[PDB]
Design a protein around this ligand. Structure first.
Ligand SMILES: *[C@@H]1O[C@H](CO)[C@@H](O[C@@H]2O[C@H](CO)[C@@H](O[C@@H]3O[C@H](CO[C@@H]4O[C@H](CO)[C@@H](O)[C@H](O)[C@@H]4O)[C@@H](O)[C@H](O[C@@H]4O[C@H](CO)[C@@H](O)[C@H](O)[C@@H]4O)[C@@H]3O)[C@H](O)[C@H]2NC(C)=O)[C@H](O)[C@H]1NC(C)=O
Ligand SMILES: *[C@@H]1O[C@H](CO)[C@@H](O[C@@H]2O[C@H](CO)[C@@H](O)[C@H](O)[C@H]2NC(C)=O)[C@H](O)[C@H]1NC(C)=O
Ligand SMILES: *[C@@H]1O[C@H](CO)[C@@H](O)[C@H](O)[C@H]1NC(C)=O
Ligand SMILES: *[C@@H]1O[C@H](CO)[C@@H](O)[C@H](O)[C@H]1NC(C)=O
Ligand SMILES: *[C@@H]1O[C@H](CO)[C@@H](O)[C@H](O)[C@H]1NC(C)=O
Ligand SMILES: *[C@@H]1O[C@H](CO)[C@@H](O)[C@H](O)[C@H]1NC(C)=O
Length: 1901
């Protein structure tokens, strides 16, 4: 059973080997698509991130300095990769390292020491114990003051204008030379050297004078003198000891200048990172016209963008507010306090107005500071002051301390300057810059407002004025100073570009990621919603309760674990079966074209005739379908692993799984294959049912509702969803390497169910035969000619088909057919009517395929190929031309040749001669003639003359039983004349049978020879007009004893005969009436097509409905507003509470109220948030989880794991492989810690855990747990919060700081002015703006959009439930906080108008699909009118085709009116895009109806030449879609040259006609949307729907479409019968007929001649039926008929008749029922007119000749007048023609069967090369050159009564054109032709113009 399947695969594979284009599109299409998609991979490489950890933000209840470092420091959120110590349990601050923090730390140290210092006033009492007792030690360089008892030379000596010594007579040249050096050498050591170098040049006058000054000894020996000074100066030296230690030890402004001074002094000074590198070291660690110019430069400077977006809502902006009741004014007072804790900088200029000269002179002329300069340097102060100063710290020096202390001027310029004269203008510059910068921060930013609509309007104006922070709408009650109602809302309205967009509360489609893009998506805490949240919350609390601050609240993000993003891998492998489907859309289309292609030409059924069963067919297509698909799948595997697309899953099972899906897409291709009846309708419709085979997967990716066995329920029915789900299994087990067994199971069971649908859909759409019974004998040509019984085709088709018993007939066997159901079926071939061509295999391979397919192949059929080649007759031309379509004419010779190939036991052929006349009996009767000697060959037929040429026997079934049997001689002498005897013996008159053992006057002398011949030789004389068929009554032999009767006329007396023997020899208003007649016909085909195509009305309306119902769902984009609450507000989660630093200060008080009866959130003795619905179910006692046996693993984690790390590792992301998250090996952060389910959450009390590594690891394992299951999982928790205590390691608390400002203020000129009062009080509040007694810290997750605000509301809620004194519950306090953004501006409403416009461009492309899909209906009815029926037929009758195209076009408008109106009712019954208004209706509707007016002309010149039916539907839908999407890009100009192309689109669509409705439709809805919103809140412009902007271009062009209609009809305007031209005169009485083969163009010149161009193109031009000048007379009255059956494909029979009469007669009243005198005349009114439409079979040609009958022509034409008219309608329809031309109409004729035409004709017609000039009757043409077949293959009347007296057996004589006849019986026909023959030649003048003696019965001209 192999080689029939090997050759059968030779058929299937050879079908593709002989094409070489569908194989290359086939195997090259997935190459192209998968390489393009693999390019879309290799454009986007994988994106990797380390394990991101995040800094903590700060919030202004913490302190003003930590959060302004929170703004300047970390805008970027920089992913530190290692936990920044804010993410530790205890330590929070993150900014020890900030040197700005050490500055105000030093402010606290200097103030808190100056609270406890007595130094300068003890210096004052040193001075007063020097002012009173010592009484003079005011001592400068020049002179010495001393007023005492002169303990050590108490005197004076003046370095003055002259040398004066006030102890004796000084008396000086040397005077000014002495004191000029003396004030120069006025030093501690140069007092002695001045008198020394002087005393070298002076005398012992400088010995007593120097003797007093040595006893003076420069203010150090004098300090020894009194004892009361000594203790007081000891307190001086100790006081300057500790002040020296502190004032050096502060160290900060020293290092501040020693970082800022390098950058802006050096020569190049160019920018780098180094400016904000060094500034980033200043504020953090290692890891008005000048105002406006400055803010422009700060937006200009790079690496300062995001901090400018963040600082702009701090320093410029302005905030506002609602109802101002004085209690609520306390709220605004206290938020104003939290801003004016930054306001210590306005007064700072106020110091340098006031304190500056006091300092400048105190450091110049205070004698107290002179003593500080005195004791600052001495030898006793070297040991003492450098003992305490050397032990102070690593100080500058005592000499350097002396340097920066007290000058008189500069000492030297070049050496080293580090001094206060430098420093005083250093700090003076500093306060200038800080003054002018901090004169740009409007810290008066509050504006109370009574009505919130003024707040929104003023809000809009201020927003356009560049400065707007939030606006806090309250819900305060009345102007009544009951403080707050115990439960406040508030409503922080901000604009859209800062507060997060409040439409969606989660990420949407969850991709992984940390979501920390700092500009795009951190948007609460640079735009600064949250800052309003914290400040305003702490304000409300401080009103309601009374406690002062005692909380900071930081913001830490939860860290995110080292992910990757491969969104192309993810959405690609999630959406695999689209681009897997595409290559097999092409493959499915090719294989389904194969199946129904050979179903069309009936190769399956003739293959079943060849003795096969359907198993081998369907299996063969299964295999050879499978192989190119399978190699495409293997090529996907090679492009799939090696192309870097899917690692981690082993490359074998992708090939196995694609092999399975290849199998099941094949069986779904057979399932969609067995239902179609035409080649290319299937070959384009199959891929679209492969889309709709696919789409429930895309329709099932989101809804999700089919989780359980509903996957099996929608998988047993559907194959590609079962592939998509298994590929979801690939995508889930894709990055780390329900189930796939479900996928292969539903695939395999889906295939088996598809095969049950294949068979169960297949069944739903010597050689005797004894069954009454006969015996088809040895034969050598049998025949069965019975049409009175309609089961003769069922007799042969039952004799060899799939029925051993009969079908409603005698169920019995013949020659034991069931006993040899493969043997006798393997013996006797057949040849069906449907010509088995195997359309493009090869000629010798058609012979080889039918031969080997029969059997005896490898040896015998090789030899039989040559003998088969001895039957056709073109061996090398079969080799050169092998394609069966390439041959022609003798195709039926290859049919019967293919049947008679091999060993033909009983070749039961049927109808072998339906072809060309000179090859019909020549070809088929030549092959049946020469191949006759083998065995019996039955042959049914329709034309009977070939059966008369056939030569063993005949049969005539009466009603299922043979009314005769025996050869044609036996029916001849028992009853041409046999063809007439196929009716008179077709009834039940008489039956005869002789079933014997099958085991020209010279014809008158031959007639008398037959008279003298029948006696000696027993013979029955029979001359059939050309050949003396000498029958004989002989049982055996005598073929040589009878040759003497042939010897009497042995001149070519050939025995062309057969067998016991038988010998043979050779010897107007009617215009508009036709207009409404055509419209009537269209009304008929419309109204009668119920099952007919209402799909062209249902389809556009329903796809408008799927567009609009798709449009009801989409997000509106204009609802950035909402009114949210801010609880946790998410569905299921659980938070966590870390009670860190458990030393029960106030944190115990906090957690004590965060987990008690008011609970975690916002309700208050009522369920206030609306879906929260309290539902307190959950115990009050801590209950952990059960643990598997790894707590010994935890005990041996107590070995070697402490809090430094405390899990194992994680399966970290790698360099060449990657992982989406990253897994733990064991249990990361391992024990499940304590639980407490309270209100829809179970807050897991971490306590002292390592919180960051817990969050990373346990987030990993809960995601990777619930991702294998793939519930497409959201997030597990959204925000926790540690509690805490930050240490009190700072100086003793805030009240002592304030008291230090108290007595610091009381000392040193206590003042109440504008400057020093406000500066000192503001410094007091600023310094109390840094203490954080505790601090909670919020750990939010950021993946929820609204977490950051929300837990902040939860915590500030908790502080409110904490601090209250002893109320009767903390239950009904509490605070919510509604985010609610602000109405949009011009630009934002405009931009969302643009987006909503694009979302409606979707509706443009779908309604342009539907009204793109209407006109193809009108096209395909025009193809059904152009295909050989009534374009030509109705164009024959004089119509002037302007009215024809205007008829069809006016209808197509009128039929366009209905479904477009239905679409108008669709989205006017909907409420989108068109409404009640007068700018919605007209520009829609007139555009639609006028849009049908637009398209419907332009489809007609696309429908002249489209030479294939019922596919312009498809391809015009395609090209019209490409016009639409060309529209979509043609105004996607938003993603003056742009106005040159996009405003050139109006001139581009000025001649373009189908884009205009789309894009002008989008101008319509853009205009109504834009004016809707914009006059919806603002001023008015003109509503311009019907204006010249959008719509008038559409009305201009598409109302210009009538020019395209003129292009259509103008495109069509370019497109008896006496033929005696440049002589065949067809007169008005004859019956002509075209029977010639020497010419070919007479038929094209006939349909041309019956048509417009009456003469032949490229030939003689003359007057033969001229139809040009007097048109609609000659060629238009003359009825014709095409070669096919012009049948009005589904119109009606009766209305086809009466309509065809109505369009031409102008007899409309009598043309109402002229079809009774025509349809009743044609004999087709019962079974042809009531059963209206496709009246089957032979009645169609009767209706065609009927449609040419009613014309009433002057000359008729009927070519191919019969093709299935075997029973009666050949000579009966020919009898109707005989009535036509016999009534005086002079018909024409053309036939592929010269017998039945030649019997009825009267004159032949044939053209050699010029005109026809063929004028001959049948007996004359036979007399010169049956006889009609032999001649067609090789190259007054009263004397009938005289013969009726001569021939005494006077029979009848049917008339003729010129001729007569004689039907006398052959009883004694001796003298019947003897005396009439010798008299026929004797009295041939009686037959003068007849001029013939032409030849039981006879006929004679
Ligand atoms: C909770 O659990 C987490 C688990 O991650 C702990 O996080 C650990 O925190 C440590 C903080 O000190 C991290 O150590 C850092 O490691 C960096 C990486 O350099 C390593 O170098 C060694 C040898 O040189 C190699 O073996 C490693 O493979 C790395 O190459 C160090 O650079 C870093 O040192 C710091 O650098 C900065 C910047 O230069 C300096 O400013 C600073 O002074 C210091 O020198 C530091 O040592 C550790 O990676 C991290 N993870 C793990 C798995 O240990 C938390 O600490 C736990 N919580 C508590 C409260 O302990
Ligand atoms: C901002 O938009 C809102 C809603 O679109 C407007 O709120 C309206 O308030 C008035 C007060 O009675 C009523 O018309 C409606 O309750 C609200 N909606 C509408 C559509 O009017 C608010 O007035 C707008 N403000 C501005 C300045 O446009
Ligand atoms: C600041 O530095 C001191 C070093 O004396 C250290 O003890 C303290 O813990 C640090 N504080 C913070 C919040 O980092
Ligand atoms: C300000 O200090 C600078 C330091 O370079 C000095 O040159 C200048 O003279 C000082 N100006 C006054 C007015 O003291
Ligand atoms: C608000 O604070 C500013 C300081 O920033 C101050 O000048 C102003 O007087 C305050 N106004 C009220 C009403 O407290
Ligand atoms: C709102 O603002 C418009 C101008 O923007 C102004 O004409 C109108 O009077 C304002 N209405 C109110 C209630 O403030």
């Amino acid at each position: 059973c192999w080689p029939q399947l090997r050759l059968l695969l030779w058929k299937n594979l050879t079908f593709r080997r002989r094409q070489t284009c569908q194989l290359l599109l086939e195997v090259a299409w997935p190459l192209f698509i998968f390489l393009i998609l693999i390019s879309v991979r290799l454009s986007y490489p994988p994106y990797e991130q380390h394990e991101c950890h995040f800094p903590n933000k700060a919030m202004p209840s913490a302190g003003t300095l930590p959060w302004v470092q929170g703004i300047i420091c970390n805008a970027n959120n920089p992913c530190f990769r290692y936990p920044t110590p804010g993410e530790a349990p205890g330590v929070v601050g993150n900014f020890n390292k900030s040197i700005v923090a050490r500055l105000f730390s030093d402010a606290r140290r200097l103030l808190l020491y100056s609270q406890k210092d007595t130094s300068m006033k003890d210096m004052r009492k040193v001075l007063r114990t020097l002012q009173q007792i010592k009484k003079s030690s005011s001592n400068l360089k020049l002179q010495d003051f001393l007023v005492d008892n002169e303990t050590f030379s108490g005197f004076l000596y003046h370095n003055l204008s002259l040398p004066k010594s006030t102890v004796d007579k000084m008396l000086r040249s040397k005077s000014e030379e002495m004191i000029q050096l003396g004030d120069q050498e006025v030093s501690e050591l140069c007092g002695l050297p001045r008198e020394k170098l002087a005393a070298a040049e002076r005398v012992l006058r400088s010995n007593m004078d120097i003797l007093k000054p040595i006893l003076r000894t420069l203010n150090s020996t004098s300090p020894f003198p009194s004892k009361e000074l000594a203790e007081a100066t000891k307190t001086l030296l100790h006081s300057l000891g500790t002040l020296a230690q502190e004032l050096f030890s502060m160290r900060s402004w020293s290092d501040m200048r020693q970082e800022v001074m390098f950058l802006t002094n050096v020569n190049s000074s160019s920018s780098s990172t180094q400016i904000y590198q060094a500034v980033s070291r200043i504020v953090c660690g290692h890891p008005t016209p000048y105002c406006n110019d400055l803010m422009k430069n700060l937006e200009s400077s790079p690496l300062s963008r995001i901090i400018w977006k963040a600082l702009k809502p701090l320093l410029v902006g302005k905030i506002l507010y609602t109802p101002d009741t004085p209690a609520t004014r306390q709220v605004m007072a206290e938020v104003n306090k939290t801003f004016q804790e930054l306001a210590v900088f306005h007064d700072l200029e106020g110091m340098w107005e006031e304190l500056s000269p006091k300092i400048w002179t105190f450091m110049e002329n205070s004698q107290e500071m002179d003593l500080v300069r005195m004791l600052l340097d001495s030898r006793d102060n070297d040991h003492f002051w450098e003992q305490q100063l050397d032990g102070l710290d690593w100080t500058a020096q005592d000499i350097v301390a002396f340097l920066a202390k007290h000058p008189e001027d500069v000492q030297s310029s070049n050496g080293s300057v580090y001094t206060w004269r430098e420093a005083f203008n250093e700090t003076n510059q500093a306060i200038r810059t800080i003054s002018r910068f901090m004169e740009c921060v409007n810290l008066n930013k509050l504006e109370p407002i009574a009505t919130e609509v003024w707040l929104i309007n003023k809000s809009m104006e201020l927003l356009d004025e560049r400065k707007f922070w939030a606006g806090i709408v309250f819900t305060g009650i009345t102007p009544g100073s009951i403080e707050l109602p115990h439960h406040v809302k508030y409503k922080i309205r901000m604009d859209i570009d800062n507060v997060e967009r409040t439409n969606k509360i989660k990420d949407g489609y969850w991709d992984p990621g940390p979501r920390a893009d700092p500009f795009e998506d951190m948007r609460y805490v640079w735009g600064g919603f949250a800052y309003l949240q914290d400040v305003v919350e702490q304000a409300i609390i401080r009103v309601l309760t009374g406690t002062e601050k005692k909380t900071g609240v930081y913001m830490q993000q939860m860290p995110y674990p080292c992910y990757v993003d491969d969104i192309f891998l993810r959405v690609m492998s999630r959406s695999m079966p689209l681009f897997m489907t595409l290559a097999w859309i092409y493959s499915v289309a090719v294989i389904i074209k194969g199946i129904v292609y050979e179903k069309e030409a009936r190769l399956k059924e003739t293959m079943r005739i060849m003795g096969l069963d359907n198993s081998i067919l369907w299996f063969s297509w299964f295999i050879s379908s499978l192989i190119p698909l399978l190699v495409s799948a293997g090529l996907l595997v090679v492009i799939l692993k090696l192309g870097n697309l899917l690692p981690y899953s082993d490359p074998s099972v992708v090939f196995v799984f694609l092999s399975v899906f290849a199998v099941v897409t094949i069986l779904q291709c057979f399932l969609i294959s067995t239902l179609f009846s035409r080649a290319n309708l299937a070959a384009a419709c199959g891929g679209i049912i492969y889309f709709t085979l696919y789409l429930p997967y895309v329709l099932c990716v989101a809804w999700q509702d089919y989780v359980g066995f509903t996957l099996k329920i929608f998988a047993s029915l559907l194959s590609p969803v079962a592939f998509g789900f298994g590929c979801e299994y690939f995508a889930l087990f894709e990055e780390q390497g329900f189930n796939l067994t479900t996928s292969v199971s539903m695939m395999l069971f889906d295939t088996f169910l598809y095969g049950v649908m294949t068979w169960y859909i297949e069944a739903v759409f010597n050689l005797v035969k004894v069954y009454r019974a006969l015996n088809f004998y040895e034969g050598q040509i049998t025949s069965f000619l019975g049409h009175n019984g309609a089961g003769k085709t069922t007799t042969m088709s039952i004799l060899t088909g799939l029925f051993p018993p009969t079908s409603g007939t005698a169920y019995i066997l013949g020659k034991d057919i069931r006993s040899e159901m493969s043997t006798i079926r393997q013996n006797l071939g057949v040849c069906p009517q449907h010509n088995v061509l195997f359309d493009m295999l090869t000629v010798e391979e058609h012979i080889w395929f039918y031969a080997r397919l029969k059997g005896l192949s490898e040896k015998h059929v090789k030899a039989e190929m040559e003998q088969m080649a001895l039957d056709v007759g073109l061996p090398s031309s079969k080799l050169k031309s092998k394609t069966s379509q390439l041959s022609g004419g003798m195709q039926r010779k290859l049919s019967v040749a293919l049947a008679f190939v091999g060993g033909s036991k009983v070749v039961i052929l049927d109808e072998p001669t339906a072809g060309v006349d000179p090859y019909s009996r020549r070809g088929i009767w030549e092959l049946l003639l020469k191949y006759r000697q083998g065995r019996t060959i039955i042959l049914s037929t329709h034309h009977m003359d070939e059966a008369d040429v056939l030569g063993d026997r005949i049969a005539i079934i009466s009603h299922g039983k043979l009314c005769c049997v025996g050869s044609s001689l036996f029916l001849k002498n028992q009853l041409l004349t046999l063809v007439k005897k196929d009716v008179e013996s077709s009834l039940s008159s008489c039956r005869n049978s002789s079933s014997t053992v099958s085991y020209d006057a010279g014809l008158g002398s031959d007639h008398e020879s037959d008279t003298l011949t029948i006696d000696v030789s027993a013979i029955s004389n029979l001359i059939r007009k050309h050949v003396s068929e000498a029958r004989l009554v002989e049982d055996i032999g005598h073929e040589l004893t009878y040759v003497l009767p042939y010897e009497a006329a042995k001149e070519g007396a050939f025995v062309e005969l057969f067998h016991d023997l038988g010998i043979s020899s050779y010897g107007w208003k009617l215009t508009q009436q036709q207009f409404v007649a055509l419209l009537w016909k269209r009304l008929l085909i419309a109204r009668r097509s119920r099952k007919g195509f209402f799909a062209q009305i249902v389809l556009p309306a329903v796809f408008v409905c799927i567009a609009l119902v798709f449009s009801l769902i989409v997000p509106p984009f204009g609802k950035y507003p909402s009114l949210e609450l801010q609880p946790w507000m998410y569905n299921e989660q659980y938070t966590f509470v870390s009670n860190d630093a458990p030393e029960d200060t106030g944190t115990l008080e906090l957690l004590n109220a965060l987990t008690k009866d008011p609970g975690f959130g916002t309700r208050c003795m009522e369920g206030n948030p609306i879906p929260d619905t309290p539902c307190q179910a959950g115990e009050e006692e801590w209950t952990t989880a059960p643990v598997p046996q790894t707590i010994m693993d935890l005990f041996q984690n107590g070995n070697w794991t402490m809090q430094n790390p405390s899990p194992a590792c994680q399966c970290s992301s790698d360099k060449i492989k990657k992982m989406l998250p990253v897994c733990p090996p064991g249990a990361g952060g391992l024990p499940p810690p304590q639980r407490k389910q309270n209100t829809a959450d179970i807050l897991q009390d971490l306590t002292g855990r390592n919180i960051s590594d817990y969050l990373v690891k346990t987030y990993v394992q809960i995601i990777a747990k619930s991702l294998k299951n793939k519930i497409w999982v959201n997030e597990f928790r959204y925000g926790g919060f540690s509690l805490g205590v930050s240490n009190t390691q700072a100086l003793p608390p805030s009240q002592e700081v304030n008291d230090a400002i108290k007595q610091m203020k009381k000392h040193l000129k206590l003042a109440k002015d504008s400057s020093a009062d406000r500066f000192l009080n503001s410094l007091g509040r600023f310094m109390t703006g840094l203490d954080t007694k505790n601090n909670v810290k919020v750990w939010f997750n950021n993946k929820g959009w609204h977490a950051i605000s929300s837990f902040l509301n939860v915590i500030n809620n908790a502080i409110l439930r904490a601090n209250l004194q002893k109320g009767e519950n903390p239950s009904h306090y509490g605070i919510t906080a509604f985010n609610h953004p602000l109405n949009l501006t011009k630009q934002q409403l405009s931009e969302v108008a643009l987006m909503t416009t694009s979302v409606d461009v979707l509706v443009s492309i779908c309604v342009i699909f539907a009204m793109s899909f209407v006109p193809a209906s009108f096209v395909v009815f025009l193809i059904q009118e152009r295909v050989s029926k009534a374009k030509h037929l109705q164009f024959i009758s004089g119509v002037k085709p302007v009215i024809y195209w205007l008829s069809n076009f006016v209808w197509d408008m009128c039929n366009y009116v209905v479904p477009a109106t239905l679409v108008i009712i669709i989205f006017i019954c909907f409420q989108q895009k068109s409404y009640v208004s007068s700018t919605n209706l007209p520009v829609l509707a007139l555009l639609l109806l006028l849009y049908g007016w637009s398209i419907t002309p332009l489809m007609y010149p696309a429908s002249f030449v489209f030479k294939i039916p019922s596919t312009a539907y498809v391809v015009l839908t395609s090209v019209n879609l490409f016009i639409g999407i060309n529209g979509s890009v043609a105004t996607f100009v938003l993603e003056l040259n742009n106005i040159n192309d996009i405003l050139k689109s109006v001139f581009l669509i000025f001649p373009h006609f189908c884009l205009g409705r789309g894009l002008i439709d989008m101008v319509k809805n853009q205009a109504m949307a834009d004016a809707l919103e914009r006059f919806g809140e603002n001023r008015f412009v003109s509503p311009l729907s019907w204006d010249l902007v959008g719509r008038n271009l559409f009305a201009m062009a598409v109302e210009g479409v009538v020019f395209f209609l003129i292009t259509v009809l103008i495109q069509y305007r370019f497109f008896e019968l006496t033929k005696i031209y440049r002589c065949v005169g067809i007169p008005p009485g004859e019956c002509f007929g075209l029977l010639g083969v020497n010419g070919a163009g007479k038929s094209s010149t006939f349909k041309m001649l019956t048509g417009d161009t009456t003469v032949t193109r490229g030939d003689a031009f003359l007057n033969k039926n001229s139809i040009l000048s007097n048109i609609h007379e000659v060629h238009q009255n003359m009825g014709y008929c095409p070669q096919f059956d012009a049948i009005t494909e589904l119109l009606t029979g009766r209305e086809h008749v009466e309509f065809f009469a109505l369009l031409r007669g102008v007899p409309e009243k009598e043309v109402g029922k002229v079809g009774e005198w025509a349809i009743r005349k044609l004999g087709l009114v019962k079974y042809g007119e009531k059963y209206a439409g496709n009246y089957s079979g032979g009645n169609k040609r009767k209706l065609s000749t009927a449609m040419a009958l009613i014309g009433g022509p002057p000359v008729v034409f009927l070519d191919e007048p019969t093709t299935g008219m075997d029973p009666k309608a050949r000579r009966f329809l020919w009898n109707c023609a005989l009535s036509v031309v016999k009534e005086g109409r002079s018909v024409v004729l053309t036939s592929h069967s010269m017998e039945e035409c030649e019997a009825l004709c009267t004159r032949m017609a044939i053209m050699v090369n010029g005109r026809f000039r063929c004028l001959g009757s049948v007996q004359h043409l036979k007399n010169r050159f049956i006889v009609v077949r032999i001649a067609g293959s090789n190259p007054f009347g009263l004397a009938f009564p005289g013969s009726v007296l001569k021939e005494k057996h006077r029979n009848m004589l049917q008339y003729q054109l010129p001729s007569s006849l004689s039907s006398l019986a052959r009883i004694f026909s001796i003298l019947s032709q003897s005396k009439k023959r010798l008299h026929i030649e004797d009295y041939s003048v009686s037959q003068t113009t007849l001029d013939q003696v032409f030849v039981h019965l006879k006929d004679l001209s």
